[PDB]
Design a protein around this nucleic acid. Sequence first.
RNA 1: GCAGAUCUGAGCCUGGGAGCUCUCUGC
Length: 87
Amino acid sequence: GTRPNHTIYINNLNSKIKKDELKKSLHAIFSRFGQILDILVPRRRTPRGQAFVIFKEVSSATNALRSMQGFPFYDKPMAIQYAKTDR
RNA sequence: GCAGAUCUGAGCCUGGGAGCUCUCUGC
Ligand SMILES: [Mg+2]
Ligand SMILES: [Mg+2]
């Protein structure tokens, strides 16, 4: 179970992309919904196509989730959820 | 300790990946 907050968690991402390019791409797509504070691509033992996007306002996160839910991104559909704990 | 680093460092856990530890670099 989750509830809305500033951050959104995205998995099922193209792991063949460089971490740098993935950040710049996510910023260009999601910044349309509002102001972004930071994008976090954590380092894991294996590439698992995970990323976080932290907006300044929750409204930006709610609209970003609904809109890009399942929308293609680098030939793969995005699975988006809310973050467990606020950032 | 903070920050970063492996489809281009590594051992585990998991076996339907929001997990643990180590190592390297900078401070
Ligand atoms: Mg597995
Ligand atoms: Mg050290």
